[PDB]
């Protein structure tokens, strides 16, 4: 609760190019909300809302990210879960700043990887029929994805 005061302070100052509208529940700094804007298709047509849930033992135990906005991705569960090794159990380092994790989630969004997916069906489609994928995720961003911020 002392480090989170300085981390969230660093985001509001230097600013995050891929992360906007960082609004959190006050007093209780265990749950965060934010809106992600990818830079590359088929997702660069909308914006998706994530929710961070820092556990009590932060930063000696890593947070958990869940997608509130539905998304078409092989490494993202339908509920919103995400397999990310940089916040996994046997990999988590307490020095890892939060903004460091977000930019590591952006890479998974921009360039997915199907070798270890959460939805194998979409993982097959991304590797075999790319054009069918970039069209489904295109239509899936338009329907469920929220609008991109102005500037």
């Amino acid at each position: 609760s002392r480090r989170l005061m300085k981390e969230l302070e660093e985001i509001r100052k230097s600013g995050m190019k891929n992360f906007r509208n960082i609004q959190v529940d006050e007093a209780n700094l265990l749950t965060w909300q934010g809106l992600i804007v990818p830079d590359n298709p088929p997702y660069d047509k909308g914006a998706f809302r994530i929710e961070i849930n820092f556990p009590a033992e932060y930063p000696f135990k890593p947070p958990k990210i869940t997608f509130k906005t539905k998304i078409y991705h092989p490494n993202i569960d339908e509920k919103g879960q995400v397999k990310l090794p940089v916040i996994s159990a046997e990999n988590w380092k307490p020095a890892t700043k939060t903004d460091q994790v977000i930019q590591s989630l952006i890479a998974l969004v921009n360039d997915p990887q199907p070798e270890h997916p959460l939805r194998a069906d979409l993982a097959e489609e991304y590797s075999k029929d790319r054009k069918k994928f970039c069209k489904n995720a295109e239509e899936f961003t338009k329907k469920y994805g929220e609008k991109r911020p102005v500037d």
Binding site: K83, L84, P85, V86, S88, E90, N91, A107, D111, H116
Partner: protein
């Protein structure tokens, strides 16, 4: 082709010398290491000047001049 000479520090600390070109893809480098030291390009992580050298770009994108040093680190476990 005597266009670029770079150094890479291995896991055991030994620093081997590679020869490449300024317009060489970064993926090409991760392959030469495999033929040289036997580490697959999946189990590799290249660090220069602090930030990670992901595969997909080229040597020219990073300010990597001749006679530069490059570090080889392990990649994250079981994702």
């Amino acid at each position: 082709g005597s266009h670029m000479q770079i150094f890479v520090r291995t896991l055991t600390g030994r620093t081997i010398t590679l020869e490449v070109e300024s317009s060489d893809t970064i993926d090409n480098v991760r392959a030469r290491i495999q033929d040289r030291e036997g580490i697959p390009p999946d189990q590799q992580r290249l660090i220069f000047a602090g930030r990670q050298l992901e595969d997909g770009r080229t040597l020219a994108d990073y300010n990597i001049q001749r006679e530069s040093t490059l570090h080889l680190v392990l990649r994250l476990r079981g994702g």
